[PDB]
Amino acid sequence: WKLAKNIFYMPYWMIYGEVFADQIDPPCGQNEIQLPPCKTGAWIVPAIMACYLLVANILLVNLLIAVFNNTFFEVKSISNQVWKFQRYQL
Amino acid sequence: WKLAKNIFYMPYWMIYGEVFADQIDPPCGQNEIQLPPCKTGAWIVPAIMACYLLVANILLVNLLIAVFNNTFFEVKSISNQVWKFQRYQL
Ligand SMILES: CC(C)CCC[C@@H](C)[C@H]1CC[C@H]2[C@@H]3CC=C4C[C@@H](OC(=O)CCC(=O)O)CC[C@]4(C)[C@H]3CC[C@]12C
Ligand SMILES: CC(C)CCC[C@@H](C)[C@H]1CC[C@H]2[C@@H]3CC=C4C[C@@H](OC(=O)CCC(=O)O)CC[C@]4(C)[C@H]3CC[C@]12C
Ligand SMILES: CC(C)CCC[C@@H](C)[C@H]1CC[C@H]2[C@@H]3CC=C4C[C@@H](OC(=O)CCC(=O)O)CC[C@]4(C)[C@H]3CC[C@]12C
């Protein structure tokens, strides 16, 4: 079950300004002490990290900003009128 | 080819809240153990870092917020009508 935890753990905190910079692309397959060998296709992980961070943090958050902004006025008027209606129930 | 990787590595993650604070301006050219000597013009790197972070994070992201916001209504109406058209194809 730790695999399912590792699916959601670091990509979720990646949205809130913690990119885990020590684990983006650690040096491996060299001697600095002998490092463990390079996993195959481990260079893909920073690239899809870049695409994910771009899509999430720039596209979806700003789109939710636009959604919150362009539906603010109708929701504000409806909420004011509904609160004035629910004053009687209170 | 590691030079081309180093071009894109840290400035890209600099947008998402990871400024790499240990490598902004490390102490050098002193004894704390003898540090390696100061590179010439290494003080320029935090200044252009400051200008880059300002321009990127404050100018361009907020401008994309404005672009997403002011074209939201036309895109929303067009997308609703296009989805209602593509219901038949589905
Ligand atoms: C659909 C949207 C609106 C809500 C989000 C729901 C899911 C994305 C959440 C809710 C329940 C969550 C699960 C609740 C419990 C666990 C057990 C957890 O197990 C461990 O951590 C085992 C311990 C370990 O070995 O570390 C792994 C994550 C997981 C599957 C969670 C994965 C994410 C889930 C499916
Ligand atoms: C302006 C923005 C919207 C896009 C520009 C950013 C990307 C084009 C950059 C940022 C991070 C970069 C990646 C950072 C690290 C790597 C790992 C690198 O692989 C290795 O170095 C091998 C393994 C190792 O030596 O540790 C291959 C390039 C790649 C995928 C880079 C490809 C280009 C990326 C995706
Ligand atoms: C134009 C916009 C819309 C898209 C962005 C495209 C480029 C900015 C990307 C796409 C392909 C990328 C290249 C794909 C592969 C590599 C090899 C990579 O090589 C290594 O990492 C060598 C291993 C090492 O020594 O660390 C260095 C980055 C580089 C040149 C990447 C640099 C960034 C590039 C040019």
Side-chain angles (χ1 to χ4, degrees), chain A residues 17 19 21 24-25 46 49-50 53-54 57-59 62 65-67 69-70, chain B residues 5 9 12-13 15-18 20 61-62 64-65 68-70 72-73 76:
Chain A
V19 311
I24 290 179
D25 187 36
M49 171 156 178
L53 274 190
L54 173 76
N57 280 122
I58 308 292
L59 185 56
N62 293 1
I65 285 173
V67 169
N69 209 311
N70 281 265
Chain B
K5 183 190 102 122
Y9 192 73
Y12 185 66
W13 316 124
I15 317 166
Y16 306 108
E18 177 60 48
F20 305 92
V61 178
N62 293 1
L64 194 62
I65 285 173
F68 274 8
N69 209 311
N70 281 265
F72 182 83
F73 188 64
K76 176 197 221 330

Side-chain angles (χ1 to χ4, degrees), chain B residues 40-50:
Chain B
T40 306
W43 49 272
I44 283 192
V45 178
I48 66 181
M49 171 156 178

Side-chain angles (χ1 to χ4, degrees), chain A residues 1 3-21 23-31 35-88 90:
Chain A
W1 278 109
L3 312 173
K5 183 190 102 122
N6 287 348
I7 288 166
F8 294 99
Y9 192 73
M10 290 203 331
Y12 185 66
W13 316 124
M14 266 193 190
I15 317 166
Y16 306 108
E18 177 60 48
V19 311
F20 305 92
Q23 337 191 24
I24 290 179
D25 187 36
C28 38
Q30 313 154 0
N31 303 296
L35 302 153
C38 281
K39 307 297 218 172
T40 306
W43 49 272
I44 283 192
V45 178
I48 66 181
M49 171 156 178
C51 299
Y52 163 70
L53 274 190
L54 173 76
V55 162
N57 280 122
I58 308 292
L59 185 56
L60 287 187
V61 178
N62 293 1
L63 190 81
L64 194 62
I65 285 173
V67 169
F68 274 8
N69 209 311
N70 281 265
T71 74
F72 182 84
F73 188 64
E74 307 104 307
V75 158
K76 176 197 221 330
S77 309
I78 274 147
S79 288
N80 273 110
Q81 289 282 288
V82 159
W83 174 83
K84 292 227 266 303
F85 177 77
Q86 284 168 359
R87 292 214 36 211
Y88 178 87
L90 159 84

